[PDB]
Design a protein around this nucleic acid. Structure first.
Lengths: 135, 219, 97, 48, 35, 27
RNA sequence: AAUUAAAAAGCACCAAUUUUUAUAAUAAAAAUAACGUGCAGUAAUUAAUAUAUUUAUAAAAAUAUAUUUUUUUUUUU
RNA sequence: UUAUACAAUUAUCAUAUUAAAUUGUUAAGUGCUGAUUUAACCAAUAAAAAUAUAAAUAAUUUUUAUUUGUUUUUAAACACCAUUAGGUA
């Protein structure tokens, strides 16, 4: 739609309600890294054609009727305005609402063009451009 | 505990003035605006003041601030802000003076976005080498004229088409057909003969007399 | 043969009706106050000759003083008895065949 | 307290309703929000 | 509060239908009829 | 239908009598 | 003797204001509120909405277009 | 403390969704293709710089629809208001 993170979240959010097995999402640098981080945390069952430089399929994960991915949202909620997260923002995202948050996964892209979640971002004291959240 | 910058600013104010600030500065006062002029007869031609206008250059809403992170800060290491600039030559109508349009960034934290504003500078070129269309790198210097405190340090990209048009005896850039108008009244172009200019003049003066009749209002 | 038409154009330019019709825009000090008075809060109607313009940049693209739409054919159909058809062919928009 | 949620926070906005002073709207909203809440064990079982 | 408003809606609907019938019987009682 | 014939016969004051105005009546 | 809240709406009356004037003299006198209705009906009368024009039944009426309203025995990329 | 204004209306800041469509006089069809009919010859028009992150990369233009003007043996007709004939369009 606007940015590939926005339609990458939009197609998964629309295909998890329709109870589909594979979602064809366009592969960019910031998209397949977010998908790999989602696969690491257990929100995605697998991938098809992951080495394709244009688009790849996400094999979704289901458990007892309902979907694993409940809420998936981009950081650019307008599709236009982007944000730069400080490491103070990453430590806020790790301890949000007074608890310790390994539940909701906030993903960012650092200055070294590596896509990491907020836990590894707090672990090595860096931030980045925030891409999306998913739980 | 780690104190913030407001503690250091309060310390500076205490060491300068002996005290930080006289309290009860808000006072919760109702600023009442009373009207004096008529409904559509405010004595101004552009901006008609009818509300309590806030005064302040950086203490107003929505809040702006300069954004120091741009192309110039990425390229040039500057001794101070505004020392080196990079822009485009837009006017060479004056001798030894290139008009350079440059850009800077101003940040809105409420909408969280930076926007590029444009500032025009007068720079100095002694040998008359700057043509309209050159990407130039200008630097601060002494006062040369009343509005010249910059000089063209380097021509980062010369306009080859402008120089080849100047070799042809033409202008460097063809002049624009649009620009600034002279009035809010729609400037109509007169297409009349040699003999039919008097009746066109009578129609124009009659239209001006009707616009003066608008002073009377009703009836 | 061209001296007659050139001298006629040069004498038409220096006529007082042409110089009165193509006067510049009246300033704010010439109209009156800072404003509030109807009819004198703006300038008056300015007429330009497209071949010998007394202003630079006849047209503009502003929000309120936008005048490119008023240069098209049809606004000069009001006065065709006084019209100059060579100036109509050279300077008009959306002329028919 | 009827659900046993002592460590919780709830905020209801009723301005987009036709009748914001209706008393069933607040209890209906709290029950619909608590019904849509997933536990930590359910999410951890869904993820593996 | 809307259920009492629907009851007022149906009673006003009943009297707006037979308004011309009831206006005569009040006018005979108030002795206002132009013969 | 015989009772509605006298509605044009009454005076304008006590004509619309359960309501103050005659504009919002059934026309 | 039926079904009916799925919100159709904000010439006069009511003092946010506004209008007029002084000719060798230069502002205090008069008038006017702003806004919406407004008895205009029937005949078991009467499709509605939007735009434009003309008539003092003007809160009305007429004319010229467009859109919608069909309850299944006509159509189905 | 809305940093959110539920729908439909009262009103102002206003891009006509286009190969199914628009225009055609010097090109076509033409009694104004829409009475029949979800389908209409030919001609012009479907895509064509970098960038998607880039912090406005774009323009200041047009009217296919409704009225109203523009000319007088200068529409024969058809339709409309004065009643059978004038004008009006």
């Amino acid at each position: 739609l606007y940015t590939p993170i926005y339609d990458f979240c939009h197609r998964i959010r629309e295909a998890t309600e329709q109870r589909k097995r594979f979602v064809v999402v366009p592969s960019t640098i910031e998209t397949r890294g977010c998908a790999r981080v989602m696969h690491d945390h257990g929100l995605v069952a697998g991938f098809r054609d992951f080495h394709n430089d244009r688009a790849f399929a996400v094999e979704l994960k289901y458990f007892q009727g309902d979907s694993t991915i409940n809420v998936i949202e981009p950081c650019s909620y307008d599709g236009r305005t982007e944000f730069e997260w400080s490491p103070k923002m990453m430590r806020r995202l790790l301890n949000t609402h007074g608890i310790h948050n390994r539940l909701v996964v906030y993903i960012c892209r650092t200055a070294d063009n590596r896509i990491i979640d907020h836990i590894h971002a707090v672990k090595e004291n860096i931030g980045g451009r925030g891409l999306m959240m998913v739980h | 505990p780690w104190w913030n910058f407001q503690t250091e600013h309060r310390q500076r104010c205490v060491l300068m003035y002996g005290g930080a600030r006289t309290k009860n500065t808000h006072n919760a006062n109702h600023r009442v605006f009373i009207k004096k002029y008529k409904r559509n007869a405010f004595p101004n031609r552009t901006r008609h003041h009818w509300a309590v206008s806030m005064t302040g250059v950086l203490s107003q809403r929505p809040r702006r601030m300069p954004w120091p992170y741009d192309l110039t800060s990425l390229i040039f290491n500057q001794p101070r802000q505004g020392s080196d600039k990079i822009g485009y030559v837009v006017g060479t109508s004056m001798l030894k003076t290139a008009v350079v349009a440059t850009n800077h960034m101003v940040y809105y934290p409420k909408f969280n976005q930076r926007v590029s504003r444009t500032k025009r500078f007068f720079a100095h070129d002694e040998d008359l080498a700057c043509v309209e269309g050159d990407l130039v790198h200008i630097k601060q210097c002494r006062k040369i004229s009343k509005y010249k405190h910059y000089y063209v340090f380097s021509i980062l990209e010369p306009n080859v088409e402008g120089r080849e048009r100047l070799k042809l005896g033409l202008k460097a850039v063809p002049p624009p057909l649009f620009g600034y108008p002279v009035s809010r009244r729609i400037v109509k172009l007169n297409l009349t003969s040699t003999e039919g200019t008097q009746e066109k003049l009578a129609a124009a003066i009659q239209e001006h007399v009707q616009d003066a009749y608008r002073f009377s209002g009703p009836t | 043969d061209t001296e007659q038409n050139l001298l006629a154009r040069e004498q038409h330019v220096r006529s007082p009706a042409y110089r009165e019709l193509h006067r510049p825009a009246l300033t704010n000090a010439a109209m009156g106050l800072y404003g509030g008075e109807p009819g004198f809060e703006k300038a008056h109607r300015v007429w330009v000759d497209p071949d010998r313009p007394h202003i630079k940049h006849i047209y503009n693209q502003t929000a309120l003083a936008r005048n490119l739409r008023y240069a098209r054919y049809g606004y000069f159909k009001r006065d065709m008895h006084l019209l100059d058809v060579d100036k109509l062919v050279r300077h008009a928009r959306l002329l028919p065949t | 307290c009827a659900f046993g949620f002592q460590h919780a926070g709830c905020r209801i906005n009723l301005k987009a309703t036709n009748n914001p002073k209706s008393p069933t709207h607040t209890v209906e909203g709290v029950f619909e929000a608590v019904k849509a809440l997933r536990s930590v064990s359910e999410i951890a079982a869904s993820r593996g | 509060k809307r259920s009492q408003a629907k009851l007022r809606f149906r009673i006003r609907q009943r009297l707006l239908k037979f308004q011309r019938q009831l206006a005569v019987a009040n006018a005979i009682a108030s002795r206002s009829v132009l013969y | 239908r015989w009772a509605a014939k006298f509605y044009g016969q009454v005076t304008f004051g006590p004509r619309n009598y359960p309501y103050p105005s005659s504009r919002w009546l059934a026309r």
